[PDB]
């Protein structure tokens, strides 16, 4: 049963060094017949897969070019681990960064093992946000609906948490009642650093004049609970 | 070496077979060829590797074929738990390793066009200097949607990001968040913002739009 558990800071400034460690469990570094290969592998908020470096059995360590030297891959022998190490990271460089295991036969006497030229186990992953800012509550702003936003006999309204710092937040209607054609966005990273998502509800027009709409927002990284009354605008 | 997959999404019921493509810029051996499945939420999962290899745990269904540029990976027939992203891999004797941008497989449905709204920015957000528009487009199908911010006399570059939620569980449609962000200043320069929508399901694109100050 190989296993792969990852730590380290996932929040830091601008140019900082990112540090993260992966624990082997189930394997050894170099494995039965030399032909383990220790990757991180990173995917960038809503793009693919983008390999970064390895180290083989042998120690040897080969990194993604467009990184240039600013990556540097190490082992703990002594306890199984591999560190990632990232030099003067840029909001480029945020993203979900996984230790993944690859295998690439070495010795001609051995067996094709399975997964051959193949990522077979990945981490969990640690998410990295480079921005900075600090632990920042958001801004809860109305979307409110008016003229601009029906579509026959449908009106639109939500609210606007923005400039928030780290993710995530957990949004609700009503405290929970109102959940039929609810929208919650994943959030986008500005390019100050800081989060913002929106949660938007369909509901018919006339309930805008019968009906009340609250947005519950919680944002536990800085225990920051904001309720915001979402009212039609009149005009 | 570059990978490019095909068809950019793949829109397919249980029963119906996938063919999803990848294309390198040169020849490689089928050795090198590893697709890779992943679902939101969570870390990619291998499938083939070697080509045609089925990784410990991949059900029958999932087959790889080709070789030299063109490769493969076939599904027979989807089943519900098929729906997700597909990367292709190129695993060679030594790195760089390069992924293709992948596929992802959504469920079929009719095509449903967008309810388009536009939200000002709220009074509250102008007093701290920041002026945000947010344009809505609600329970479409398919997940293709082109979003245009005009402001004035100039379509906007470089100042809007996107957010798109998962295929809805009950309808299998999608719903966009479309966020104009402007400082206070530059916000109150103009009068006419306007988001444009253009999707399969809308006769002609459709435009929301305000006139700021006014109402
Ligand atoms: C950025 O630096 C400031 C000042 O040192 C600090 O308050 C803030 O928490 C830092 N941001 C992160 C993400 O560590």
């Known amino acids: 049963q190989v296993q792969l558990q990852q730590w380290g800071a996932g929040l830091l400034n601008s140019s900082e060094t990112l540090s993260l460690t992966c624990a082997i469990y189930?394997?050894?570094?170099?494995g039965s017949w030399n032909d383990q290969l220790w990757n991180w592998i990173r995917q960038p908020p809503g793009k693919?897969?983008?390999?970064?470096?390895?180290?083989?059995?042998?120690?040897?360590?080969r990194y993604q070019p467009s990184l240039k030297g600013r990556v540097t891959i190490s082992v703990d022998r002594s306890k199984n681990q591999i560190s990632l190490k990232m030099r003067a990271v840029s909001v480029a460089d945020t993203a979900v960064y996984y230790c993944?295991?690859?295998?690439?036969?070495?010795?001609?006497?051995?067996?094709?093992?399975?997964?051959?030229?193949?990522?077979?186990?990945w981490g969990q992953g640690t998410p990295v946000s480079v921005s900075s800012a600090s632990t920042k509550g958001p801004s809860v702003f109305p979307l409110a609906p008016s003229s601009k936003s029906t579509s026959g006999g449908t009106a639109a309204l939500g609210c606007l948490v923005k400039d928030y710092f780290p993710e995530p937040v957990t949004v609700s209607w009503n405290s929970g009642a109102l959940t039929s054609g609810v929208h919650t966005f994943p959030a986008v990273l500005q390019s100050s650093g800081l989060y913002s998502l929106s949660s938007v509800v369909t509901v018919p027009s006339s309930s805008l004049g019968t009906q009340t709409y609250i947005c519950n927002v919680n944002h536990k990284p800085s225990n920051t609970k904001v309720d915001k009354r979402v009212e039609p605008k009149s005009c | 070496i570059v990978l490019t997959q095909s068809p950019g999404t793949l829109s397919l019921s249980p029963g119906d077979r996938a063919t999803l493509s990848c294309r390198a810029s040169?020849?490689?051996?089928?050795?090198?060829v590893a697709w890779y499945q992943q679902k939101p939420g969570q870390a990619p999962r291998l499938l083939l590797h070697?080509?045609?290899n089925r990784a410990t745990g991949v059900p029958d269904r999932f087959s790889g074929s080709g070789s030299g540029t063109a490769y493969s990976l076939t599904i027979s027939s989807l089943e519900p738990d098929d729906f997700a992203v597909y990367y292709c891999?190129?695993?060679?004797?030594?790195?760089?390793?390069?992924f293709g941008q992948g596929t992802k497989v959504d469920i079929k449905r009719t095509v449903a066009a967008p309810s388009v709204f536009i939200f000002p920015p709220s009074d509250e957000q102008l007093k701290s200097g920041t002026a945000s528009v947010v344009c809505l487009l609600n329970n479409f199908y398919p997940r293709e949607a082109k979003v245009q911010w005009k402001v004035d006399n100039a379509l906007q570059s470089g100042n809007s990001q996107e957010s798109v939620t998962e295929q809805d569980s009950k309808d299998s449609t999608y719903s966009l968040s479309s966020t104009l962000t402007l400082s206070k200043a530059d916000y109150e320069k103009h009068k006419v913002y306007a988001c444009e929508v253009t999707h399969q399901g809308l006769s002609s694109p459709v435009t929301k739009s305000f006139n700021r100050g006014e109402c």
């Open positions: 040169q020849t490689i051996a089928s050795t090198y």
């Open positions: 993944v295991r690859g295998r690439r036969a070495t010795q001609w006497w051995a067996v094709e093992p399975p997964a051959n030229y193949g990522f077979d186990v």
């Open positions: 189930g394997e050894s570094f170099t």
């Open positions: 891999q190129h695993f060679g004797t030594s790195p760089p390793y390069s």
């Open positions: 070697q080509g045609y």
């Open positions: 693919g897969l983008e390999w970064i470096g390895e180290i083989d059995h042998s120690e040897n360590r």
